[model samples]
Target: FRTQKPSLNTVNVVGSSMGSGGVFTIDGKIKCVTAAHVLTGNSARVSGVGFNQMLDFDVKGDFAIADCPNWQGVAPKAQFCEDGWTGRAYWLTSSGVEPGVIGNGFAFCFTACGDAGSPVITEAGELVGVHTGGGIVTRPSGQFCNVKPIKLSELSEFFAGPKVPLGDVKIGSHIIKDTCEVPSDLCALLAA
Candidate 1:
């Protein structure tokens, strides 16, 4: 299998075995995240080796989110947190990623299969989004829409459950703040 490391997880699947998308975290505990469809088609069983630490969960208390039941997850802190692109929340509820829409592609690309629940960061290292699904994006290339991101203020709701919030990801955790560049890159973009 071919391999590449954008952050941590990477692999090249050939033939019938196609890898979907996913993300995870490990502050105090290991938590995994993936596109609902990615986990559902795989029989609700989280994929990859040592993924037991990742817990598959549906967005609770939000019907507009179009919750995906029994998603994918892994266990025991997969890797150190990596900061990349950042995506702002266009809406509170879950919806399809519209490529045709201008600037709607903010959270377009982040994590991939074997690496769901991975944090989507801004140029300033802020945890702006989380990797969710594959079907939402174009196929073959495995592009994804910014579908299931944890609302910045909704962290408490996610932690309210009895599960101890094994892998609660947030925007502040990985935002790469801009500095000393006249208005700053992040500020300009956010202003736009």
Candidate 2:
């Protein structure tokens, strides 16, 4: 239940939760979605390999959205297709939260310290969640991974303004980005 307002220049730094950015369908409007914590200020500088632009955004809870212009060299828009999510999912990052059989929420994979804004996408390139932090999880199989993601569904409340139920949290469960700590019982059932 804490919120930080760092100067824009300090955002996207080594420890920021501003994980990757992508396009999403909000109330039928295509908007750029990123970790809410990322946009500490009302405006931010969005960039990719060959391009960078500053834009204004609106945020609620753990998610942020902006009416952004499509970038030239960024990764292709990851479809927010409900049909593509099977509850079991994987993402690429510098570090991950943990390793285990997780339940309905998101799980971490290999991600890095400064890769906070890394996009969590599916094998077919569907955007499901964003990388927030690493996890130290206890697996049901008695195994463990150093770190992983906790999924963006916790920010479901933010999306409710334009739509309903905050973007179909049909998945089993969700974790809040701020806490960065998963419930012990819920962690036990997450997929590895």
Candidate 3:
């Protein structure tokens, strides 16, 4: 699923942890995704609690498939959770108009913004997807990406420490079949 099951109102945009741009849960119970370049080259620090609220899970596994394999095994002084969010939703990818057809979405918003992070939700209301970079609108109307919460399967290697059951909110199916809202610029480029 693309989104977790929970109300976004429960999500809190916290400040003062790693820095002004640090995006971590207020309760200290989740992982954070930051600009890969800022930390190492392809890897970031995975230690104790981050942002003074959520716990910083130390990865323990191969640095190939995933950075951390034993992530679930560690338990810090945090309440790592996975739920709650509060942000606008857009298509996961950029949109485009048909070859000859015209569109409006592109004329409005260009792409996803950095630091937007992957939004999620938990029973107590927590969000995920910390400091991110590329998952943003890199072009005016070409590519579009966002840092949204990833599924358990997507982060298995990132947390190579241990494995545990995630009780965070789950994403349900909410499909919209409308062409007017989609970016025609993307459609035109892809269909061609």
Candidate 4:
């Protein structure tokens, strides 16, 4: 939490509480993305930008893509990489750009009540992932925010199952593989 800085093209999402969202072009249309969990019903609109409606959701990725018909701007270049947490990255919200030390699938930082759908961008402003929520990890490293990598399939090994074999299912603006996960990090045997 820093300033009351809100971002352009990105807006707030309202569900149980206030959440955040990002506006961008996916496929051939303009849409906004936020955590699907933020919506109890399809009632969120893009503030400051105008009337954008919730069109669909990528359930597994938990991304709610809203269709904003009239808004137009240059869509920032976005990428989905195998290990996107490399180098330095920042997450956007009403609090502004938050830079954090990158590691694994999380960012070490603190976000406020309305940050669930915030965009995690790299130093060069390339969109890499979406802020899911606060990381569920121990604190020798402080609080890190967990993210839903843009393309869930990139985290392929993190997920596994027999019935959930997904070659590639499009979710939100991302193409995700719908597989189940057991926190693959749990598989690393202690060297001690």
Compare the candidates by TM-score and give the number of the best one: 4
lDDT of each: 0.28, 0.41, 0.25, 0.51
For candidate 4, give the lDDT of residue 71: 66
* Least accurate 10 contiguous residues by lDDT in model 2: 1-10
Candidate 3 lDDT, 93-164, residue by residue in tens: 111110110012211122233232222222233222222342432221123333333332322322233333
Over 4 Å off, model 2: 1-20, 23-31, 87-103, 111-114, 133-192
Score every model by TM-score: 0.30, 0.46, 0.23, 0.56
TM-score, ranked from best to worst? 4, 2, 1, 3
The runs of at least 3 residues in candidate 3 whose Cα sits more than 4 Å from the true structure, single-residue gaps closed, are 1-20, 23-25, 28-33, 40-110, 115-125, 131-178, 181-192
Best by lDDT: 4
How many pairs in model 3 have backbone atoms within 3 A of each other, for residues 3 or more apart or on separate chains, i.e. clashes?
Answer: 48
Model 1 agreement with the true structure over 52-136: per-residue lDDT tens digits? 2223344321100112223233322333223332333211111222111102443322222233333333333222334433313
What's the residue-level lDDT of 168 in candidate 1?
A: 27
Q: What is the lDDT of residue 74 in candidate 3?
A: 29
lDDT by residue for model 2 over 1-192, one digit each (tens)? Answer: 111321111123111323445544445454555555556475667654454677677755444557754544334444553632333334433233221212333344322323444444455555555444354222212222334345544432212232222222223333433432344333323322
- The per-residue C-alpha lDDT of model 4 at residue 21 equals 75
